[PDB]
């Protein structure tokens, strides 16, 4: 469990560092910044690389919503959930701290005024979207993310390709939802930067712990009840694929 | 069949949500929008991830043109075609509806005036291209898409790599054809947004049901008649690869 917790902590640290640092240091650079597309690519690549690196150790969740959705899908023991979550959160926080230090090396940096890549809705949405839009988008994208994770790791899916699918799914989610809420779908990532923003981000933090997790659960349930093959169905397929 | 229909519906929902939402919410964002390249990447990633997730269940078509072209290529039973198509369409519509709701959360949104990422030609083409250009581009790109799908899923192709090839092919198709017609090559995706546009999009909708499907058929025929190896050819290759 120590190995697994260390893997989850390092993975979440990598995710937060990569994505949030790309957003804070490079997204708005004059005449050469990477923009929203670059930020989405960075977020996807963090998960892809860290999955390839330590998924064989811990399973590569790096997300409390992912862990809880996998539990709801019947794929992860309940007794191990809490530990995982704690590790993830801790990792994120550490990353944020280091990021803060780095961001302080440039004149004029102000975490409170810039927002420090914090998630928000309504008046604090990047595009000025309402609370209902944020709720709908977060729910749908979390459910889709969990569905993709469940499908790609199924025993009948191509072996070894899951990290690519999951990382590119995260990139797509960011590409879709950055203008609405800043694309959290990850409570630990939201918390890590909300702590250092210190203002309105902490007031709205609860929203990004409830909506993603709920969405993840829904995703798991769907794959558990509508898409996964039952034991009898597996046996039937095996018998139907026998030469005669 | 219920599992397969659910998989197709969810896949088409994912495709429409991802691609059209990226086009509507993030493509034109000031100073940080993702642009045409970002939209093309999102469209490709939706198909890639959904294929990795549920292709082992339903085959991962998510496109009426793909289903009909696979039928014409001798790879999909006719009696199952209609069901698939219906599922796909339904999925798309649902996605569009949710997208509409989300788009309504920002002040000044107007689906009719903006076009809601609808496909069009002539006066309604993004780049002001004529009907003939739209016809030629849609035909060629649909044929190429079906050819790629047939080749990548061939029993002699590398195993497990088909989703990557198909998704990146869709991304390339968008990169090429977005300025001409908005890159439909998918009747369900066109219908989903044309319904909510409610104006000229419905007048031109027929064009994007006929041209793609026909193109797909052509693609299938080509692979069926010029590229697929016959039974005798397979036996000859097997015998030619025997040690002596």
């Amino acid at each position, epitope marked *: 469990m120590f190995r697994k917790l260390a893997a989850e902590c390092f993975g979440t640290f990598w995710l937060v560092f990569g994505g949030c640092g790309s957003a804070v240091l490079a997204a708005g650079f004059p005449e050469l910044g990477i923009g929203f597309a670059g930020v989405a690519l960075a977020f996807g690549l963090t998960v892809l690389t860290m999955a390839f690196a330590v998924g064989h150790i811990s399973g590569g969740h790096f997300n409390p919503a992912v862990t809880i959705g996998l539990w709801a899908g019947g794929r992860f023991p309940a007794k191990e959930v809490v530990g995982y979550v704690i590790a993830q959160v801790v990792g994120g926080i550490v990353a944020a701290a280091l990021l803060y230090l780095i961001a302080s090396g440039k004149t004029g940096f102000d975490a409170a005024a810039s927002g420090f890549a914090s998630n928000g809705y309504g008046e604090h949405s990047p595009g000025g979207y309402s609370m209902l839009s944020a709720l709908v988008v977060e729910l749908v994208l979390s459910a889709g993310f969990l569905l993709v994770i469940h499908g790609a790791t199924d025993k009948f899916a191509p072996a070894g390709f899951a990290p690519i699918a999951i990382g590119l799914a995260l990139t797509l989610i960011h590409l879709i939802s950055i203008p609405v809420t800043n694309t959290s779908v990850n409570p630990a990532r939201s918390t890590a930067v909300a702590i250092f923003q210190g203002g309105w981000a902490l007031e709205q933090l609860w929203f990004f712990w409830v909506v993603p997790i709920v969405g993840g659960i829904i995703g798991g349930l769907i794959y558990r009840t509508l898409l996964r093959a039952s*034991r009898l*169905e597996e046996e*039937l397929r095996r*018998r139907l694929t026998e030469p*005669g | 069949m219920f599992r397969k229909l659910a998989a197709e519906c969810f896949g088409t929902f994912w495709l429409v949500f991802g691609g059209c939402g990226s086009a509507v919410l993030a493509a034109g964002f000031p100073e940080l929008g993702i642009g045409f390249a970002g939209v093309a990447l999102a469209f490709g990633l939706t198909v890639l991830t959904m294929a990795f997730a549920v292709g082992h269940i339903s085959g991962g078509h998510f496109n009426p043109a793909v289903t009909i072209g696979l039928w014409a290529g001798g790879r999909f039973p006719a009696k*199952e075609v209609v069901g698939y198509v219906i599922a796909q369409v339904v999925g798309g519509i649902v996605a569009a509806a949710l997208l509409y709701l989300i788009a309504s959360g920002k002040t000044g949104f107007d689906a009719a005036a903006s076009g809601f990422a609808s496909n069009g030609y002539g006066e309604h083409s993004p780049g002001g291209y004529s009907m003939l250009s739209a016809l030629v581009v849609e035909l060629v790109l649909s044929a190429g898409f079906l050819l790629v799908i047939h080749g990548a899923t061939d029993k002699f192709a590398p195993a497990g790599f088909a989703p990557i090839a198909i998704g990146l092919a869709l991304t390339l198709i968008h990169l090429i054809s977005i300025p001409v017609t908005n890159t439909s090559v998918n009747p369900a995706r066109s219908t989903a947004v044309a319904i909510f546009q409610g104006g000229w999009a419905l007048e031109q909708l027929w064009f994007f049901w006929v041209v793609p499907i026909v193109g797909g058929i052509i693609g299938g025929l080509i692979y069926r008649t010029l590229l697929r190896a016959s039974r005798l050819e397979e036996e000859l290759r097997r015998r030619l690869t025997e040690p002596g």
Partner: nanobody
Amino acid sequence: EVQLQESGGGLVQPGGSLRLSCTASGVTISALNAMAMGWYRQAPGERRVMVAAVSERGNAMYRESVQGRFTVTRDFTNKMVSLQMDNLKPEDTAVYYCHVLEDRVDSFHDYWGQGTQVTVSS
């Protein structure tokens, strides 16, 4: 135990169609709803292999070489399973058995029918 009674089948020229039916008895509807109902076939000198089935959740499954020509239907209330064969070929000549698969946690149990002859000769 479960008792399976089949019907239909016989002689048909190539390109014709046939409909086999099978009914179960000696089992309650609720108990049968948790089982899979399908069709096996044995051709002269070969294996007895499954060609089509309907699972406890109503999902129709087919063998690759027969999908597109065979249609398997299940009536849960009537405890019935039927198979419709269209565009028959010489390779379809065989003895067809109604089959029931039951899940016993650590293994599966098979219930077999009497068998019906299907001969496709021009």
